């Protein structure tokens, strides 16, 4: 109604002062955020139209003082506003001294800081850290600043200061980029090793393992040892260390996975401990399938090992068909 009256405002000053007394009355109703916030934005707007009238900053300071009298983060938005016009006024530092007077008196003003520090860059470091006394995007951004200045190690420190805060959730959002970057930098073992150690508390295992293989190897294999895709990887790296482990890996693997244990066992005994491996092929084929029947039939056919054991095998698989059909 004050807005429509403002539209109606020839004695605009009368309607404005009436809006002020209206603030005096409405204030009683407020016992605050958007009410106080619009109240401040409108009062300062009255001092803004007054500024257009050359009628204003002092009275604006008075209404802002009333905002100080208000009785909160939205009130900080009000402080952010008085500071906003105050900087738009042509006294940047003078207002910052005031918002600082408030925070030193002690948070809402910080959103204005992000509004300010974002362009204050164009030294700034302490200006930025003032935020840390009182927002991961902001953090990565700032580290990117120092990276642009190539302070490098200082930047890594920032990621140290972030992660002590946000815990295993947001910290991951920091940490994935922090790893990819710091590994990209120095590319000394013990320091980065420790860094993954701190880090560890899924992809982290993969970055870390990727590091270990090319900078102790078995140690890495122990780490992978320490889900199907993960099982598949380890087996790959173990194959990279040579063949023998991989057959060994599957035994770990067993405890859709049977398809993979079959996938490893296939070339295991198939290229062939070998008796334990063939009997294991039986144990796995029996573990849980017509292609597998083709497999056992192939193993039987390979011999230049007996129709009896073969018919017994098909009989056992038929028994598996029985136990399967018996299932509800």
């Amino acid at each position: 109604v004050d807005d429509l009256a403002s539209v109606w405002c020839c004695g605009e000053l009368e309607l404005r002062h009436e809006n002020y007394d209206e603030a005096l009355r409405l204030l009683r109703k407020a016992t605050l955020p958007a009410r106080r916030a619009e109240y401040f934005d409108g009062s300062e707007p009255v001092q803004n139209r007054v500024y257009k009238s050359l009628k204003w900053s002092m009275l604006a300071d008075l209404e802002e003082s009333l905002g100080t009298f208000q009785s909160y983060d939205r009130i900080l938005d009000l402080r952010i506003a008085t500071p906003q016009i105050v900087i738009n006024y042509a006294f940047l530092e003078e207002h910052k001294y005031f918002e600082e007077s408030f925070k030193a008196y002690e948070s809402l003003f910080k959103w204005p800081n992000v509004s300010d520090i974002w362009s204050t860059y164009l030294g700034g470091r302490k200006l930025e850290r003032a935020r840390d006394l009182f927002l991961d995007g902001c953090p990565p951004k700032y580290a990117k600043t120092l990276y642009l200045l190539y302070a490098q190690l200082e930047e890594e420190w920032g990621l140290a200061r972030h992660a002590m805060a946000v815990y295993e959730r947001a910290t991951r959002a920091v940490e994935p980029a922090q790893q990819y970057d710091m590994f990209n930098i120095y590319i000394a073992e013990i320091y980065g090793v420790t860094h993954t150690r701190g880090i560890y508390q899924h992809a982290r295992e993969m970055c870390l393992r990727f590091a270990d293989m090319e900078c102790g190897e078995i140690d890495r294999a122990r780490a992978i040892y320490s889900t199907w895709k993960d099982f598949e990887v380890r087996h790959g790296n173990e194959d990279t260390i040579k063949e023998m482990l991989r057959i060994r890996r599957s035994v770990q693997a067993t405890y859709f996975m049977a398809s993979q244990m079959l996938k490893v066992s296939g070339s295991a005994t198939g290229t062939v401990a070998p008796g334990q491996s063939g009997m294991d092929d039986m144990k796995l084929l029996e573990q849980r399938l017509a292609a597998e029947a083709e497999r056992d039939q192939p193993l039987r056919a390979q011999s230049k090992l007996f129709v009896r054991s073969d018919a017994s095998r098909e009989e056992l698989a038929e028994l598996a068909q029985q136990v399967n059909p018996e299932e509800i």
């Binding site: 035994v251 067993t254 405890y255 008796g275 334990q276 009997m279 294991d280 039986m282 144990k283 029996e286 573990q287 009896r308 054991s309 017994s312 095998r313 009989e315 056992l316």
Partner: protein, 93 residues
Amino acid sequence: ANPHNYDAWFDYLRLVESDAEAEAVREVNVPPIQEKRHWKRYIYWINYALYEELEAKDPEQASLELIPHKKAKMWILYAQFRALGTSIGKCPK
């Protein structure tokens, strides 16, 4: 832990517990639980453990283990002509 913690006293008592903890392991180190189960059944009744241990062996290397447990003249004749044969020799002899 409570299933394994159930004491093996005598032969049938430990073999009864072997049925319990093996089913518990099955439903939920898969090889070491099978190995500790193999020693419990073998270290028991000795007459009835031939049909109890081997009945959950095919579900659980295979050829060698079956021949030791099954160990009669007719069984060797049936073998020469692999889990079903060891089962036939276990129940009869």
